[PDB]
Amino acid sequence: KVRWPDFNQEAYVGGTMVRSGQDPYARNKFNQVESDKLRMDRAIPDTRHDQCQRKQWRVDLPATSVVITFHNEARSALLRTVVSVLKKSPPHLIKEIILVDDYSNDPEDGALLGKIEKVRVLRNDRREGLMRSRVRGADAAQAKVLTFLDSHCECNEHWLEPLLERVAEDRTRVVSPIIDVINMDNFQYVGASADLKGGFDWNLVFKWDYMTPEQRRSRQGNPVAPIKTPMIAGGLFVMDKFYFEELGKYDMMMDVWGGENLEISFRVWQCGGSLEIIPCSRVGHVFRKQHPYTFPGGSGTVFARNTRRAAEVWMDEYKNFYYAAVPSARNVPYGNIQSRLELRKKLSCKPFKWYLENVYPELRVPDHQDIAFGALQQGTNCLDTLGHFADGVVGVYECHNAGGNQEWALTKEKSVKHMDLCLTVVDRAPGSLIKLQGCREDDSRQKWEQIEGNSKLRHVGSNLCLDSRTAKSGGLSVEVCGPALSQQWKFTLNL
Amino acid sequence: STCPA
Ligand SMILES: CC(=O)N[C@@H]1[C@@H](O)[C@@H](O)[C@@H](CO)S[C@@H]1OP(=O)(O)OP(=O)(O)OC[C@H]1O[C@@H](n2ccc(=O)[nH]c2=O)[C@H](O)[C@@H]1O
């Protein structure tokens, strides 16, 4: 066994290098030439708030076992992740680093690192995916606290102590650093915003949300306080090992990638723990735009399968809002969920409604009797109030997926509404502009219905359809229904 | 397919 600085980086990385004239992005979907130029312990900027930099971090903390799974990772990036852990962590707080080689083409990527102090390598003899690989690493762990990292990360100064402190005080906290960005093209290390929380839309795809102006204001007193998050990104977190086991690890029937971050976030919150982001902890990650590896069965179907398994166990009736956003998911078989259901029963977990109301209230939820909801799209344009109020015209604007003036519902009363304003047919002569007015159930001018496979909107009791052809010369209008592209409209959720 | 902070 060899101390990390004695490891022969040049030999290890040499001989998987990008050959002359080859594409430096093909194998990893990041620039391997730039990754390979970097020293295994390259210096990176300290991106922490000033207040963190002054704190002196407590000493008697439990050690952690670090689990890193990988499938065909670039040698330079894998080695660098391991050395940043060793170099930036107090040595007594690292019990071990467990590398789970998830059936990489070349077993030597992992096995050669087994020489390094504190490194243990486990090789899957077939492809298992990240969920089963993480569970195998956790099972092998000897410490009281687990730490998970992706195989292309770089820990910053005093990254670990702030995370361990939270969980030593209360083992039901599952905590995450702020994830800095390692640029996929040039490998520069870039400090991320600390004003973000994890979230998702009804398609159940992870996204970053800014804190509200009010949340921000209430932290002005302690700007590096923990941030409660509805959802963790998934790959970088710290969790009490007995807690991880008691809550049921991960769903072992999830495959490859996707959905497990959603499942564990829902499970932790609903079953009595919490999820935090800790601003004094900073770890960089190579964010990329494409997966470099295969998905047996196709990536769209695997992602959907995994997500169904989460939605069917945790979301109660709200799962229907996911199926309304992604109707093609209803056709994807998802297997047996009985042991997950029994887990939920055994833990006495709160219902999903409680999660929505108490953990993620800012997620906009449709009324239970809405016919359709979300944005109303025509190509890459969306129905938009333009900031107008009652008596104002309505228009289209490029879809931006940020809600506000592009948020609509088709109600049980057949009205197309935003807040308490409704699209109103003020004049039935073809070519007339429509107007926003206060919604009244008894106003027949405000009644609309979806036609032609939920692809158009017709004013009830007429042959008039909602039409955008006059959008830049006045606003949306009503025109006789016909084969015009300017009459095509689709809600993002159809119930 | 994960998006950056
Ligand atoms: C940072 C973060 O947070 N993150 C998150 C994660 O964690 C998850 O949670 C997702 C969901 O599922 S999302 C997100 O995502 P992303 O990042 O894009 O992806 P990636 O990187 O690809 O990764 C993956 C891992 O594993 C492994 N893997 C995979 C696959 C398989 O099969 N196996 C393995 O191992 C690899 O190697 C690595 O290492």
Ligand SMILES: CC(=O)N[C@@H]1[C@@H](O)[C@@H](O)[C@@H](CO)S[C@@H]1O
């Ligand atoms: C004022 C203007 O040009 N209109 C835009 C609106 O129609 C919305 O898309 C806004 C986002 O909620 S932004 C912006 O106000």
Ligand SMILES: [Mn+2]
């Ligand atoms: Mn990653």
